[PDB]
Amino acid sequence: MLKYIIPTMMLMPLTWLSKNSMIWINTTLHSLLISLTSLLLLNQFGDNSLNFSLTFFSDSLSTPLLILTMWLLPLMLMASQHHLSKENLARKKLFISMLILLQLFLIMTFTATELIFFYIMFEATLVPTLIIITRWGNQTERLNAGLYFLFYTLAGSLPLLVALIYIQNTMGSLNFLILQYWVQPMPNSWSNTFMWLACMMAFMVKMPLYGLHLWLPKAHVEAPIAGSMVLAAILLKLGGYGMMRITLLLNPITDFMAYPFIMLSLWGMIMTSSICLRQTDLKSLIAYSSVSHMALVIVAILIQTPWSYMGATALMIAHGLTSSMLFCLANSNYERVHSRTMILARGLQTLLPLMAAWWLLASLTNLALPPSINLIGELFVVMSTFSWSNITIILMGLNMVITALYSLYMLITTQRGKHTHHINNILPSFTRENALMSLHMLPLLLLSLNPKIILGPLY
Amino acid sequence: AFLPSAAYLTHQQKVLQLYKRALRHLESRCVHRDKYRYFACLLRARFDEHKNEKDMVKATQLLREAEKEFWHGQHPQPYIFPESPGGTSYERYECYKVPEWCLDDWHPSEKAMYPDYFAKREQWKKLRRESWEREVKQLQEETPVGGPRTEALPPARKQGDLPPLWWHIVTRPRERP
Amino acid sequence: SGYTPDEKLRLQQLRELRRRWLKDQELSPREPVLPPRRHSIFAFTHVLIPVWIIHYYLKYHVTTKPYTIVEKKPRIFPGDTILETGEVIPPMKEFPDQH
Amino acid sequence: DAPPLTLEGIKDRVLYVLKLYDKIDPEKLSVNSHFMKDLGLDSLDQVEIIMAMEDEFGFEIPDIDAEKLMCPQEIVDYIADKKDVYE
């Protein structure tokens, strides 16, 4: 994995030794080269994972998350270079250093063979994200946002640490490859009940679980654009990755420990999607849509069938691309009208038609239009939850109504109707902005041609 | 009830608006032109009977039961003119009504495609920015203390001045752009 | 009662400015100043080259794989002769004639 | 389709509809004939005149605007403003 870790670290002298006019160009270029390099992780086998060393491995779960992570860094640099144009040069380099450091922590979060090293990289991701939100977020509430993001995580993750160390004392190892063969069944007891909660609640916070989700519509809203891109696209998926690894050790107790959380997710995706119908802040609407989409990934991981894991990893990759694009579109309107109020700037298709086409494609992927990988993940989770219980289709199908309703309402409010008369600073779309939208949307649509690389380890 | 200049509707205005609504709904009920023409003369005869009514309480009572008469006898789908609110072509062309300020954001290669148009646009912009301070100081020397009472704007009073707040009335888009 | 004289004067002045604005939307005869810039080609490029490409794809890549083009077997009647065998299908029994 | 309106055409059609009205004699009518002060018409007659203008040109004049059109020239100017004639 060290052929990816070392160039990601070499981005640090690359950004700190660059000429002052070259720090976006150089980091964008070489992060795109690292992202091109990331496709060598697609040496996956039908039986074995790609096991590099004692410290690092990559199966078909971690590989698309790695490719998406390494792809998101150039797009974050493109998204962030405009609103940091007037910034001090050293603070600009510190911002890029926090993004590079976050990429470095993420790529060895997903490839960590041993679970306590997964824990340390998983929690190490908090510090650059907290710094990016509280230092380069725009408003006052970022400070409060930085507290919620910090303290819902750690209150969930410090019982995980203890739990993992307990497994270290019980199994003798936290190697996931060893734990594939030495896993013992976890019977019904109170000790194993709180073992289950300590193993699961940190990832439940990261997803987020409904009812634990309150950090997200502050953290993703108050963040700068690169912060929101990495929070929605990658850091939510640390929870899903960690659940898919940790539920190996939690059988068969999961078969009744999942029942409350499944309810919290199945009703929660009804709630948060409904919340999106009455959001006045566009970026808050995109955040609540992320909570609603990750509720399906929670249900799919908890019912733990092959179809549900395939749907959940497809939905994680698809939601990463779609939610990152939606935050970038909302930012492209924020960088013109300087307000996140969705009803403010209307009729934007009359003024910005190609950006309206990007809004259309991102809305269509948000509502899971076939054959997008959004629909592939959505549909496969719906198949597996119908097999779990046939009544879930009600809460599934009603969700797909509301998901359509808030996706097009967002599209109707901002793009359609009459333009606002008094707003006259709607600049034509920059090449950087359309480029950012296309670098989200074109890989997302090309993955429909060959979705087997985003279907995870039990494709 | 809600008017830009007046604070209310007078009794005479309420009677005339009822008369126009009743004739339009009667034309919707009475599709054919001779049949509408007969019943419209009968409705005009009903309006001329209480025309010379001096008791305003009696006239207000007659207006109120005439509104109840209209509400019982209205058409469920009255005729709406196509560009009128509720019509089938209402606000259809608003997607084509691009505001004029977007021409400021054109590239010089596409402004050079229309040299005389933009040369004529720049003297409109020059006229507007030399008229602005005179029309602001016209508004503040003519508005009473406490703010304007009605939403009516004054005309230009001098020879050479433009009417205050004229630009978005004059440079509004066409109805068929 | 109609307009007040201030309303008449303001509408007259706005009318004159509006008609000047609408007159100024007409183009010049030189505008738009533009920069300086096979009878059955449709049946060749949109029909015949796609029939070539699709027949190549179906003949040498699709039908070389099993069960990709599965055709319903042809309907056999009494009295038919099979091309692959030559075996004449015998005709039906003689009808108990009805009319 | 949709032939363009001129000021002379709007004026001719407005005076045409008013000459086809039995409470107005067509020899006293001009473009500046006030309906109440020169032609001696009622306010109900003015409402009917505006409704005939609406039926003539195929669009609705609202009541806050219809109550102020008291001569043919004001009607012609209103239809001119709402249809953008002499572009």
Partner: peptide
């Protein structure tokens, strides 16, 4: 005759 300018946003970019 009587060609009118169509106001539209900038399609260059």
């Amino acid at each position: 005759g009587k060609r009118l300018f169509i106001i539209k946003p900038s399609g260059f970019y």
